[PDB]
């Protein structure tokens, strides 16, 4: 029988903690409704309601743009990590230049193996999706698998699938996930595990609960999986506190809370007002019972023939010289447009759709260096620690001295000569030469 956090079972802790998650889920639902509803859908009356498409496009476009820029401060194609050498150990290893060459070539192959693992297992994809979840809901959870086969991308969980509990210092005490799959689809020994009780139908969904919890007599997190309050045998495992494969992530940091907060909560009133104006402009167009226009070249084609009483008669003219006032005629149109421009100004600034020092030092650098560094803390550093330990456990990289070799992320900026040589010059030449006429 279990002890401590696990005493009552994984399902009991999930039901116990779920009460606290409701406000954060409600906030996420409201943010999704005015941006991209399929990022966090929760409406129940799907016999009547769609994943309702807004009239305003600004929310969706701004979210995609922000995630694209975050996925370029973070995780670029160039080198973003450093396996540092402890200076005390460097002062020992300097005894031969050949050994320093071999050791730093070793670290070079390990750094290349890390970036190899990042690109070859296409982590760039799930990281882009994770950033979308962080922007709209403030919270996300990732899992890094033990390697099998040729190709091992990660798994991402939305807030509605998990619970987490934290102390006064933000430390993770325990995590529970709720996972679901049909009875007939499960592994054969799992299908054999449920002969007793109710008769399962082949498509009956089984609720599986994963529990990860902190130990005290050991420096470890402990893991097991659970169905109907009974442990699934063989699913048990243990991990040291420095290298657990489950990674919960926050967009913003608050003390005394399990969870973080989203960015666009501050701006939901603007989005909700912009939609309200656009709908009225549509109605203002539909109800109009009169049409008004103008002929452009000073009336040198004689429109008097239209004022003369004959429907079967025609003016000489073109769409090149005729236009109509079909929305601009309406009396309140100009002011509704003007307020829409003000609201879009605030939103487009907020989603970044925009003395010898350049003032991008504020908005492209200082504004992001915070979230960039905090995601280095809560996302990148745990990930590289797990990847290094997995590569050692699979014998792929050597057992180098832990006193010497330690990771770090180099947040910042890359060189620029190669950059203009490719982007401004040769890619442009490729485009220009390919696009030239027949």
């Amino acid at each position: 029988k279990r002890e401590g956090f696990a005493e009552n079972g994984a399902k009991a802790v999930y039901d116990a903690l779920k009460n606290d998650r409701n406000s954060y889920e409600t906030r996420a639902e409201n943010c999704a409704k005015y941006t991209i509803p399929s990022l966090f859908p929760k409406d129940s009356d799907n016999a009547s309601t769609d994943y309702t498409t807004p009239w305003q496009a600004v929310g969706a476009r701004g979210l995609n743009n922000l995630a694209s820029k975050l996925m370029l401060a973070l995780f670029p194609m160039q080198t973003w990590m450093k396996l540092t050498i402890s200076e005390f150990e460097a002062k020992q290893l300097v005894a031969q230049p050949a050994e320093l060459a071999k050791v730093e070539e070793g670290l070079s192959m390990v750094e290349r193996i890390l970036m190899n693992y990042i690109e070859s297992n296409s982590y760039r994809v799930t990281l882009f999706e994770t950033l979308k979840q962080l922007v709209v809901a403030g919270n996300a959870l990732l899992y890094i698998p033990e390697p099998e086969g040729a190709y091992n991308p990660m798994k991402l969980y939305r807030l509605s699938s998990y619970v987490v509990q934290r102390d006064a210092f933000g430390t993770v005490l325990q995590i529970v996930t709720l996972d679901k799959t049909a009875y007939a689809a499960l592994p054969e020994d799992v299908r054999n595990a449920m002969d007793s009780g109710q008769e399962h139908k082949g498509d009956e969904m089984i609720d599986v609960y994963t529990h990860i919890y902190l130990d005290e007599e050991s420096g470890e997190y402990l893991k097991y999986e659970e169905i109907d309050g009974v442990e699934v045998d063989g699913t048990d495992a243990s991990y040291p506190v420095d290298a657990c494969p489950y990674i919960p992530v926050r967009m913003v940091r608050i003390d005394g809370e399990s969870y973080g907060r989203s960015y666009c909560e501050e701006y939901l009133g603007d989005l909700r007002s912009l939609e309200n104006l656009q709908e009225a402009i549509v109605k203002m167009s539909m109800i109009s019972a009169k049409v008004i226009g103008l002929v452009n070249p000073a009336g040198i084609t004689q429109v008097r023939r239209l004022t003369k009483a004959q429907t079967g008669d025609f003016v000489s003219g073109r769409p090149e010289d005729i236009s109509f006032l079909q929305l601009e005629k309406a009396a309140d149109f100009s002011v509704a447009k003007a307020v829409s421009e003000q609201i879009e100004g605030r939103l487009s600034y907020a989603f970044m759709l925009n003395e010898e020092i350049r003032y991008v030092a504020s908005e492209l650098e200082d504004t992001l260096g915070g979230v960039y560094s905090i995601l280095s803390q809560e996302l990148q550093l745990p990930m590289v620690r797990v990847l290094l330990k997995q590569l050692q456990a699979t014998n792929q990289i050597p057992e180098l001295p832990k006193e010497a070799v330690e990771p770090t992320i180099s947040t910042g900026m890359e060189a620029l000569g190669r950059g203009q040589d490719l982007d401004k010059l040769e890619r442009c030449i490729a485009a220009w030469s390919a696009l030239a006429p027949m």
Binding site: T49, T53, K283, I292, S323, Q326, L327, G369
Partner: protein, 965 residues
């Protein structure tokens, strides 16, 4: 670029010379068995640099064959080639020569299609990906289009975010900024028209059926009967998301968007002078075969673009009713989308497309236009026949309308739509104007329907009632001179106040959600505007009303359950408190209480790390001039009381578990600490009454630090500042991780410290920076300190004080580089000290803090720190832009460093070091050519740098020597 001198051209671009290139490439190819395919790794840059410029001929065949053989070897050995999308890679060498290796390419494609190798890690996967994504693949698209179509069919479709419902792989976001240039389709249409049209129709039908049966679509998708010929109808799926696919104005798949954009662009570019019979036959072919309305939208767009060529297609479109509804929705979105826009290859094409002339029109305008206007090729007999056709269509629509008691508003909308088109039932009137002649067309209208229209128009004007006041107050708040247009509220403060009283009544009398959403913040902004800008014109009754509203809105952040949103009106109200405090002495106790309780709010705002306590801090800074004792009582009161509020918060939370929003924490706090709060109100606190700062948290100390004026001369302020700096520097300089300070807090502290130091007298500066001089080490906040000093000096231009600070740190930095710049953050510290880390503008003549005298700084630096490679990098980068005024002397400094420190010729360098040295030497020679020729010493000094560049393989260095010699 117009000139032909390598010393003056903007960029240097080069190409091969001589028959050695052909000889070497041929000799490698003929003897490849004796050398062995593993060993030829040295030839890859040669074949790369040839194919980059020469794309026909024998040598281009051999180069491409060598690259292909090496790739196939890596496949057989399972060895990895680093996926990095680089112009210099091997696969680009294959693609640049693909016109010369067509049989070999065809064999590779046949094998891929035979084995269905469509998944990551199978053979040839990277090259196939490029053929579907990259513009350099265009010789393949020209040579083998029938295979490219099959490859796209294999790679894009996944049989059963919204792209999952369409049945597509999530590699799809390779196409993210959707555009006609994202896929090979635009070129396959030129290469193989009929087969590409077949492909587009098949792929669209599959994909739309996949979406239509998803749970996603269930309450958005409609189905409509589409007329084709007499008695002939077909069904199509339709909604706003499908109709607008070719515009990008709706949230839909970037791949499908890009395909439909390419189709529209091809028809608009290439059929512009076509025979009408050809053009109309293809548009009708597209209508007959699609199961998706997203094609019908493209057909409609082309009919709107060429209206006098395409009447026989327009005749078919007018006979399907629902196309009028969706095209009108498109027109309203097109008339706004451009503003929301307002990868450059794609984005300029989007911006230009928003300027297309034909986007302004829509099907109602076209139906009226054929009844009125005659162009140069159309007879009166033709126009008479056009009228007869349209009138038969209108009569057949009128005959189908329901009995009038049955009507819904959709029917009334359709009847109004018909009234805007049928010329038989209209009057005409005209007015001449500066731009031409205005025409008004006046339909003759049913009284029941007329009354419906009048009611709806009125209701709109009832909703939009206060929008002009909202506009005026917002422009006035933001100091945007567009407020001057609104002379009905400018020069009219009492009108604004009267309408504000209407709004306040409506809010109190059970105001609804739709009303409060748009109008709920107008009283706050109007009252703050009147108090800040019009106080001399108001009477005392008007002043007191404005006061009561501003003080009411200022208290809302003190209620439980408040959440901040950017225009809720509270920050507008808080900004007007200085005027009230100045004018009304009875309010001061209330305002001191409001400010104190709001400083305790730690909730963050934005992404940059600010907090809500900024808003009362801006008020306090406006009061230090006249009300010093009151504000100092707030400062000492905060430092005493804030550590107690957090303990009481924890107690209330704990008792809410024992038995949170149930309890008004502020009312409890105000009842417990009445004695100390009375000392705050009566101004009876001093710097002697504070405790020692030894255990107070750094967030609290920073919050106090931001309230003190940066140019203060007060003894108690200076004494308090001196405590805070020692406390912070102890934590910043530590190597123990447990001491580590948050990034945003660290930036916030260091910039304020720079302001305090540079406003000081010149003899006090050595006492300000002393905790950082004594504790100096290799840790990262030393770099951040130097960057913040450079920033504040650019703002302030305090020449002598900046150079005193820089002269005091010199010996410490010199001592640090002797350990070697690879340790801890030493190289970053060097680069920061030597101006290389800051973001300077692109074409600076110099800097206002550099003068002739200061050249001795760089002389000492190059004499003393030359061996650290960070020094060479920093000098070369600086002399190229911000320190450009010292160039003639910089050549000496660089030449000396390279001549003495021989190990630099063998060590590893920082990125772009060679690039900056190339730019510098090339810029100097163009100015100084005759003096370099005539003077021995200058020529030797330049040749040292050129020999270094040639040792590293620089072409520009080599050519420069051949010029100078």
């Amino acid at each position: 670029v117009s000139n032909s001198d390598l010393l003056s051209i903007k960029y240097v671009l080069t190409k091969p010379k001589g028959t050695g290139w052909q000889s070497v490439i041929q000799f490698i190819y003929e003897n490849l068995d004796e050398i062995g395919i593993r060993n030829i790794n040295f030839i890859l840059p040669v074949i790369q640099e040839w194919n980059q410029r020469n794309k026909v001929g024998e040598t281009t065949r051999l180069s491409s064959l060598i690259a292909l053989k090496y790739y196939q070897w890596t496949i057989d050995e399972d060895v990895y080639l680093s996926g990095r999308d680089n112009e210099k890679n091997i696969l680009h060498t294959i693609l640049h020569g693909a016109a010369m290796i067509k049989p070999e390419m065809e064999e590779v494609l046949v094998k891929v299609l035979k084995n269905r190798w469509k998944e990551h890690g199978t053979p040839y996967f990277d090259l196939m990906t490029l053929i579907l994504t990259d513009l350099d693949s265009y010789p393949v698209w020209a040579s083998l289009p029938e295979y490219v179509l099959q490859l796209a069919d294999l790679f894009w479709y996944r049989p059963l975010d919204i792209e999952d419902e369409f049945g597509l792989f999530r590699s799809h976001h390779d196409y993210y900024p959707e555009s006609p240039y994202q896929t090979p389709i635009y070129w396959l249409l030129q290469s193989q028209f009929k087969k590409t049209i077949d492909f587009i129709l098949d792929f669209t039908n599959k994909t739309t059926i996949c979406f239509a049966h998803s749970h996603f679509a269930k309450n958005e998708i409609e189905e409509v009967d589409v007329f084709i010929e007499e008695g002939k109808f077909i069904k199509q799926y339709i909604c706003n998301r499908l109709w607008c696919s070719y515009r990008g104005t709706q949230v839909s798949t970037y791949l499908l968007s890009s395909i439909h954009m390419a189709l529209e662009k091809f028809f608009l570019e290439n059929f512009k002078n076509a025979d009408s019979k050809v053009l109309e036959s293809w548009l009708l072919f597209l209508l007959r075969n699609t199961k998706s309305a997203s094609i019908s939208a493209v057909v409609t767009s082309i009919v709107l673009a060429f209206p006098e060529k395409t009447f026989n297609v327009a005749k078919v479109l007018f006979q399907t009713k629902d196309f009028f509804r969706f095209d009108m929705n498109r027109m309203v979105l097109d008339r706004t989308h451009k503003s929301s826009l307002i990868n450059s290859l794609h984005e300029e094409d989007r911006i230009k497309a928003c300027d297309d002339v034909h986007r302004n029109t829509y099907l109602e305008n076209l139906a009226l236009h054929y009844q009125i206007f005659r162009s140069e090729n159309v007879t009166e007999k033709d126009a008479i026949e056009r009228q007869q056709v349209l009138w038969d269509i209108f009569d057949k629509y009128y005959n189908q309308l329901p009995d009038e008691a049955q009507e819904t508003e959709a029917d009334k909308t359709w009847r109004l739509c018909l009234a805007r088109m049928d010329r038989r039932k209209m009057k005409i009137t005209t007015k001449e104007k500066d731009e031409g002649i205005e025409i008004s067309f006046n339909p003759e209208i049913d009284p029941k329907l007329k009354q419906y229209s009048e009611e709806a128009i009125k209701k709109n004007s009832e909703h939009m009632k206060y929008v002009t006041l909202k506009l005026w107050a917002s422009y006035k708040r933001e100091k945007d001179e567009r407020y001057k247009n609104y002379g009905m509220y400018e020069d009219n403060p009492q009108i604004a106040l009267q309408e504000t009283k209407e709004i306040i009544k409506k809010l109190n009398e059970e105001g609804g959600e739709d009303f409060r959403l748009l109008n709920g913040n107008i009283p706050a902004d109007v009252c703050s505007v009147l108090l800040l800008d019009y106080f001399n014109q108001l009477n005392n009754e008007e002043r007191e009303y404005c006061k009561d509203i501003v003080l009411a809105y200022s208290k809302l952040p003190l209620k439980e359950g408040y959440n901040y949103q950017v225009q809720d009106g509270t920050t507008s109200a808080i900004s007007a408190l200085p005027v009230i405090y100045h004018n009304y002495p009875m309010e001061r106790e209330t305002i001191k209480t409001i400010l104190l309780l709001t400083l305790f709010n730690d909730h963050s705002i934005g992404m940059a790390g600010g907090r809500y306590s900024v808003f009362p801090s801006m008020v306090i800074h406006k009061l230090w001039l006249d009300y010093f004792d009151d504000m100092q009582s707030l400062l000492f009161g905060f430092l005493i009381l804030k550590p107690k509020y957090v303990i009481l918060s924890r107690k209330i939370i704990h008792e809410s578990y024992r038995q949170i929003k149930k309890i008004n924490i502020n009312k409890v706090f105000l009842n417990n600490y009445k004695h100390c709060i009375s000392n705050v109100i009566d101004n009876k606190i001093s710097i002697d009454d504070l405790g020692s700062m030894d255990k107070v948290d750094l967030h609290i100390l920073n919050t106090a630090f931001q309230l003190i004026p940066v140019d203060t001369v007060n003894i108690e302020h200076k004494k308090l500042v001196s405590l805070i700096v020692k406390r912070f520097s102890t934590s910043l300089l530590s190597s123990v991780r447990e001491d580590r300070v948050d990034y945003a807090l660290r930036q916030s502290f260091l910039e304020r410290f720079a302001y305090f130091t540079l406003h000081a007298p010149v003899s006090d500066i050595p006492d300000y920076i002393k905790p950082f001089l004594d504790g100096f080490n290799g840790s990262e906040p030393i770099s951040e300190l130097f960057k913040k000093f450079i920033l504040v000096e650019d703002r302030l231009n305090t020449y002598a004080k900046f150079w005193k600070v820089w002269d005091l740190f010199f010996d410490k930095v010199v001592t640090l580089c002797k350990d070697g710049d690879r340790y801890w953050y030493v190289d970053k510290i060097i680069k920061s000290y030597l101006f290389a880390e800051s973001p300077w503008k692109e074409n600076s003549n110099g800097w206002h803090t550099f003068k002739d005298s200061n050249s001795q700084f760089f002389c000492d630096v190059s004499r003393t720190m030359g061996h650290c490679p960070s020094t060479l990098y920093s000098l070369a980068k600086s002399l190229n832009n911000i320190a450009s005024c010292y160039l003639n002397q910089g050549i000496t400094w660089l030449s000396e460093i390279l001549s003495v420190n021989k190990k630099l010729w063998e060590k590893k360098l920082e990125n772009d070091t060679v690039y900056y040295l190339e730019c510098l030497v090339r810029r100097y020679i163009n100015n100084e050519r005759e003096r370099i020729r005539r003077t021995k010493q200058l020529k030797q000094e330049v040749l040292v740098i050129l020999d270094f560049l040639v040792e590293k393989g620089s072409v520009v260095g080599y050519m420069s020597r051949e010029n100078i010699l």
